Amino acid sequence: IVLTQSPSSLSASVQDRVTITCRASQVISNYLAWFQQKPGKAPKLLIYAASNLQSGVPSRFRGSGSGTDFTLTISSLQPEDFATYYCQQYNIYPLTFGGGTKVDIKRTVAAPSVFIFPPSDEQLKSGTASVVCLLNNFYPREAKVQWKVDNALQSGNSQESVTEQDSKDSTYSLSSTLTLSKADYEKHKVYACEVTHQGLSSPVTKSFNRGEC
Amino acid sequence: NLCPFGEVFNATRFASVYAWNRKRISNCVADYSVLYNSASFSTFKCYGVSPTKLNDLCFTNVYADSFVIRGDEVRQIAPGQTGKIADYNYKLPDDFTGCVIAWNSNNLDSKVGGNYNYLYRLFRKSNLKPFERDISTEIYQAFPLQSYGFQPTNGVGYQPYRVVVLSFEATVCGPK
Amino acid sequence: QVQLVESGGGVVQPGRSLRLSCASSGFTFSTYHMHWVRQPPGKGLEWVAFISYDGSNYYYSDSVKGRFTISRDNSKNTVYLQMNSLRAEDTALYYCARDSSGWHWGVPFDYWGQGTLVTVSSASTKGPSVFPLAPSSKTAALGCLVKDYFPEPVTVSWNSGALTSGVHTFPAVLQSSGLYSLSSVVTVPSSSLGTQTYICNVNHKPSNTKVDKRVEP
Ligand SMILES: *[C@@H]1O[C@H](CO)[C@@H](O)[C@H](O)[C@H]1NC(C)=O
């Protein structure tokens, strides 16, 4: 049984009504459960049988649906409700979970400040070259980072990671790391990352010539 | 003295629907509110009696029948209804008074390879009378028991459900 | 009160076997079904296995059927997951959870332990190499690249904890070598790049390594 949980993420504000949808690939009657999970913590049951509130769970969490289509609604979002929510069908083996919905804090749009770092001579003496592109303190989370080496777009040789939402200014930060052998790094001169973010009117390019200082 | 409803609803084992278990509930005080305070029943249908006001009544005798059927067969456990279970395994009277109570029991009553312990009667010379019970093993003429074969992967209506029927008929009362 | 405590996790090579335990207290273990669900790092919840209150009924996900075996000992209040033929994709925090669904009063997955982490990997414990992300020749940003270590976690501070504002230490990434890599960055005023010295302090408890790298213009 496949559970299609929508949306996969959303931004919301305190006092907002939040609606999360779970659709099953076949009917499961009312045997659906909803869970909440906070970082580093175990999941907590909110609702079982599609609409029964677990004891101790506030009444602003409501579940609805029978058959195929189900809904979790938080009628008035509170600060402790920012979290990831999962639906689950628990009666038809093999057991199945939806894909999750991460509820983060809405704030105003903020463009990243962008920085690029060449590899250190110390890392090159070791035989590897990591080029780093930093996106600092932006919102919303969606951003795109593309690497161009001597104007050729790179694929498959970089990795990204993102911080959790900042507890004080509700932004995200992102690093994208292009990793090449020392040999390959020396094949080329110009290293550039191009950042696209809705807070920027046009994409921003940071670049450098290898060996410049 | 107290009515032993816990042995009825929490019983490890249930009988096949053809050998449906009956226990006479008599000369005791019962609290049915403990049942209403349960949001996990998939079916709680009373005939001739409102469930929330049922502590306020008294009766002569109380009989509680229990058995396991498929989920889509709980339909036949109703006044005057018919079909394969209500014709040949367990029939209610058209003038039934009481409550039918069922819940999904997949985790208790299915096995990985199919559970063939639960049985049902497929076809008998005639339809059963209300509260009639047939444990005959006579080969029918065109062996009359076949196995549900509950599996954990079965769809909703194929899965096993436990049913408890409360037939209301003085000796038994509510809160005292 | 109700408690579920998983144990047994650790770092094991692929192809090897590992047995997890979940010890209950504070409720009648013998009438509860038990489930294992896992959560791979950075991913969602994934159901693994189920065993009924007796131990007579039981099921597995397609992803582990044939390799894992679930069992329980009601006399000892514990449920087990025997994991055979482990593979990199089995790396996950493994939760145990109780389930009374199927009883007329039952509730599914109403209590979970905090999980035990299972890491399937060919890598050996290794402290990190630490390289500087020097602030640019022309608010400035700087940082430390913390490369090629195993296992998780590492800790990073700046000036022995004196510098906290504007620090971002990113989640590690798992490289195809099987080692982890991360950056830690700080933004600072440009004017401070002469006066103020900046040193990242990297601690890797599993290898008992500590490294300090000063990051210079
Ligand atoms: C069955 O056990 C549960 C849990 O102890 C209890 O709440 C329920 O009332 C019991 N059943 C009956 C009808 O006594």
Residue numbers in the entry:
A (entry chain B): 2 to 214
B (entry chain E): 334 to 475, 490 to 516, 522 to 528
C (entry chain A): 1 to 138, 144 to 222
Question: What does the literature reporting this entry say, word for word?
Answer:
Overall, a broad spectrum of potent and distinct neutralizing antibodies can be induced in individuals immunized with the SARS-CoV-2 inactivated vaccine BBIBP-CorV, suggesting the application potential of inactivated vaccines and these antibodies for preventing infection by SARS-CoV-2 circulating variants. Notably, the broadly neutralizing antibody 6-2C was less competitive and did not compete with the potent antibodies 10-5B and 13-1C, indicating the recognition of distinct epitopes by the antibodies. Structural alignments showed that 6-2C or 10-5B had nearly identical binding modes to WT, BA.1 and BA.4 spike proteins.
Overall, one of the 20 mAbs, 6-2C remained active against all the tested SARS-CoV-2 variants. Notably, 6-2C broadly neutralized all the tested variants, including the most antibody-evasive variants XBB.1.5, XBB, BQ.1.1, and BA.2.75.2. 6-2C binds to the core with an uncommon epitope between RBD-5 and RBD-7 (Class 3), consisting of residues N343, A344, T345, L371, P373, F374, F375, W436, N437, S438, N439, K440, L441, S443, K444, V445, P499, T500, V503, Q506, Y508, and N343-linked glycans, which has slight overlap with the ACE2-binding site. Furthermore, the epitope of 6-2C overlapped or clashed with the ACE2-binding site on the SARS-CoV-2 RBD, indicating competition with ACE2, as supported by the BLI assay, suggesting that 6-2C neutralized SARS-CoV-2 through the inhibition of virus/host cell interactions. Nevertheless, its potency against the tested Omicron subvariants was reduced by 10- to 189-fold compared to its potency against WT SARS-CoV-2. Structural analysis showed that the disruption of hydrogen bonds was mainly due to the S371L/F, S373P, and S375F mutations found in all Omicron subvariants, resulting in a main-chain conformational change of the hairpin loop (residues Y369–C379) harboring these three mutations. For example, 5 hydrogen bonds from WT-RBD S371, A373 and S373 to 6-2C were all disrupted at the 6-2C/BA.1-RBD interface due to conformational change.
